[PDB]
Motif scaffolding. Structure first.
Motif, PDB file in Angstrom:
ATOM      1  N   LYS B  21       0.758  -1.248   0.000  1.00 23.77           N
ATOM      2  CA  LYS B  21       0.000   0.000   0.000  1.00 23.77           C
ATOM      3  C   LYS B  21       0.798   1.313   0.000  1.00 23.77           C
ATOM      4  O   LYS B  21       0.271   2.360   0.391  1.00 23.77           O
ATOM      5  N   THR B  22       2.054   1.275  -0.434  1.00 19.38           N
ATOM      6  CA  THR B  22       2.846   2.500  -0.467  1.00 19.38           C
ATOM      7  C   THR B  22       2.820   3.167  -1.839  1.00 19.38           C
ATOM      8  O   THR B  22       2.709   2.505  -2.866  1.00 19.38           O
ATOM      9  N   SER B  23       2.891   4.491  -1.838  1.00 19.44           N
ATOM     10  CA  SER B  23       2.933   5.250  -3.074  1.00 19.44           C
ATOM     11  C   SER B  23       4.407   5.594  -3.314  1.00 19.44           C
ATOM     12  O   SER B  23       4.770   6.089  -4.374  1.00 19.44           O
ATOM     13  N   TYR B  87       9.402   5.385   3.023  1.00 16.89           N
ATOM     14  CA  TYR B  87       8.135   5.049   2.388  1.00 16.89           C
ATOM     15  C   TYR B  87       6.980   5.929   2.818  1.00 16.89           C
ATOM     16  O   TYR B  87       6.948   6.476   3.915  1.00 16.89           O
ATOM     17  N   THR B  89       2.808   6.094   3.089  1.00 19.59           N
ATOM     18  CA  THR B  89       1.560   5.333   3.083  1.00 19.59           C
ATOM     19  C   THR B  89       0.361   6.247   2.890  1.00 19.59           C
ATOM     20  O   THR B  89      -0.690   5.799   2.443  1.00 19.59           O
ATOM     21  N   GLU B  90       0.524   7.530   3.217  1.00 16.69           N
ATOM     22  CA  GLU B  90      -0.554   8.507   3.071  1.00 16.69           C
ATOM     23  C   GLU B  90      -0.044   9.904   2.689  1.00 16.69           C
ATOM     24  O   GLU B  90       0.890  10.430   3.295  1.00 16.69           O
ATOM     25  N   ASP B  92       0.641  12.856  -0.799  1.00 21.43           N
ATOM     26  CA  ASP B  92       1.344  12.814  -2.072  1.00 21.43           C
ATOM     27  C   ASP B  92       2.810  12.557  -1.723  1.00 21.43           C
ATOM     28  O   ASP B  92       3.396  13.263  -0.907  1.00 21.43           O
ATOM     29  N   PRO B  93       3.421  11.550  -2.355  1.00 21.16           N
ATOM     30  CA  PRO B  93       4.816  11.157  -2.120  1.00 21.16           C
ATOM     31  C   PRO B  93       5.998  11.995  -2.604  1.00 21.16           C
ATOM     32  O   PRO B  93       7.127  11.797  -2.133  1.00 21.16           O
ATOM     33  N   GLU B 120       4.816   5.487  -7.043  1.00 22.77           N
ATOM     34  CA  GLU B 120       3.483   5.145  -7.512  1.00 22.77           C
ATOM     35  C   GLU B 120       3.548   3.932  -8.421  1.00 22.77           C
ATOM     36  O   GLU B 120       2.940   3.906  -9.486  1.00 22.77           O
TER      37      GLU B 120
ATOM     38  N   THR G  14      -2.160  12.983  -9.102  1.00 21.81           N
ATOM     39  CA  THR G  14      -1.138  13.249  -8.101  1.00 21.81           C
ATOM     40  C   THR G  14      -0.180  14.304  -8.665  1.00 21.81           C
ATOM     41  O   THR G  14      -0.299  14.705  -9.831  1.00 21.81           O
TER      42      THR G  14
END
Lengths: 30, 178, 27, 29, 29, 30, 30
Positions: B21-23, B87, B89-90, B92-93, B120, G14
């Motif tokens: 579940k990581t972006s 990492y 999880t919540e 925008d990365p 992503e 995004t």
């Protein structure tokens, strides 16, 4: 008019008409 | 000292579920940094993500299993030396890649320590890190978007009015022959 | 003939104005 | 004036004239 | 053929067609 | 919609629509 | 896709996706 027919019509415009066309185009499409 | 089966299974399951579940998963060489550096970097991340992003040293054999349990591929190259993992999880990365990029710079550390990772779901190399780090903000990109969408109309109007500018310019390129 | 040039241009077609500028560039 | 009939009047223009002609054109459009 | 008929024809073009029109315009002028 | 899909959708718009799209985006982000 | 549907698909992108969209649009149009 097709893409080519449109260019031919612009070619036939007079200089003062072009200046007009531009003004109109801007106002028509912000 | 030794762990039970029920302990070695959930440790791996937890890490694997997180990676599913990581972006963002960015692999970094954090060797040599101090506990105080770790604290500082984590504090900067928390400032923008709360508990949505983490940075930590994980045994390679654990990373290898979790990454495989999830469904990643071509990650084996990122695990050649003792590696830490960043990492998200919540949220925008992109902002987190920006943060660890700047942090390593602020410590005068070799930016090649920032090996690629996955953004992503897409693999990125060490050479792409800076590119991600240099991306403008969402707000800026939105502003840029407007001009790019309008380009056809702007281009039409510029092209036509250019015909008139050509005359204006050639007359100045002759007038100033003074 | 300074405004007479302007008016002479005003009537020029777009295709003719191109020719004019084209021959003014060849200096 | 035709195409060249104008080019002629243009070349014969002074430096203070061309500096004004251009000015006038920028007003029409 | 008039200014208004030209604008009206351009209004009806698709964005792909407009980009192609502009590309051609850039070729000719 | 995917990025490639958004781009094809915009390509199929008429110039009038493109102008409105631009207008709305200009208010929301401008 | 309508002007509004395109706008809704755009705002769900995004940061990374927007950058990809902006660049492709840069290469296609002018």
């Amino acid at each position: 008019m097709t893409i080519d027919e449109i260019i031919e019509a612009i070619e036939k415009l007079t200089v003062s008409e072009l200046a007009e066309l531009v003004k109109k185009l801007e106002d028509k499409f912000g | 000292v030794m762990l039970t089966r029920q302990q070695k299974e959930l440790i791996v399951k937890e890490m694997s579920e997180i990676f599913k579940k990581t972006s963002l998963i960015l692999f970094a060489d954090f060797l040599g940094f101090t506990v105080a550096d770790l604290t500082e970097l984590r504090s900067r991340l928390r400032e923008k993500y709360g508990d949505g992003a983490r940075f930590r040293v994980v045994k390679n054999t654990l990373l290898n299993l979790a990454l495989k349990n999830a469904e990643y591929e071509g990650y084996e190259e990122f695990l050649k030396g003792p590696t830490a993992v960043l990492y998200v999880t919540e949220g925008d990365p992109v902002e987190a890649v920006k943060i660890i990029y700047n942090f390593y710079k602020d410590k005068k550390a070799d930016l090649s320590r920032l090996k690629g990772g996955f953004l992503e779901g897409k693999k990125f190399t060490a050479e792409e890190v800076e590119n991600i780090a240099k991306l403008p903000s969402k707000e800026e990109l939105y502003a840029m978007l407007v001009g790019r969408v309008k380009a056809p109309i702007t281009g039409l109007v510029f092209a036509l009015s250019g015909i008139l500018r050509n005359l204006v310019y050639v007359l100045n390129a002759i007038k100033e022959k003074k």
